[PDB]
Curated annotation (Swiss-Prot), chain A:
This is Crustacean hyperglycemic hormone 1. The chain holds residues 47 to 113 of 120 of the full protein. Disulfide bonds join C7-C43, C23-C39, C26-C52.
Swiss-Prot record, chain B:
Disulfide bonds join C7-C43, C23-C39, C26-C52. It comes from Penaeus japonicus. This is Crustacean hyperglycemic hormone 1. It comes from the Eukaryota. The chain holds residues 47 to 114 of 120 of the full protein.
């Protein structure tokens, strides 16, 4: 929904899903579901997503396998 | 190089390029070249990249135009 409180006005659901993969790659989201939910909050503008990106991006940059 | 001080040990160049587009989409990098360079520093773990994230990602989320 364009009125989803977590991030309003999303017309590019492809990018929303890509960003979600940062959260999913950060930890087992089912074992820490409240953290996983916070990771999605505010269009991903939140401290959990930023910290996850700090772990996941360098791990992926260091790995020869592609996205 | 693997020993690039800006980010060592990079084997996934294509991901490094994609992150660079966040910086390029954030402002005219040629007109603020020192800010553009800081944006890339430390494997993109820096305040300029993070603030650019916060402008560029919402802009792209609100625009139907896909990135791939």
């Amino acid at each position: 929904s364009l009125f989803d409180p977590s991030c309003t006005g999303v017309f590019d659901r492809q990018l929303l899903r890509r960003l979600g993969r940062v959260c999913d790659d950060c930890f087992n989201v089912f074992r820490e579901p409240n953290v996983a939910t916070e990771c999605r909050s505010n269009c991903y503008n939140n401290p959990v997503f930023r910290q996850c990106m700090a772990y996941v991006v360098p791990a992926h940059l260091h790995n020869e396998h592609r996205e």
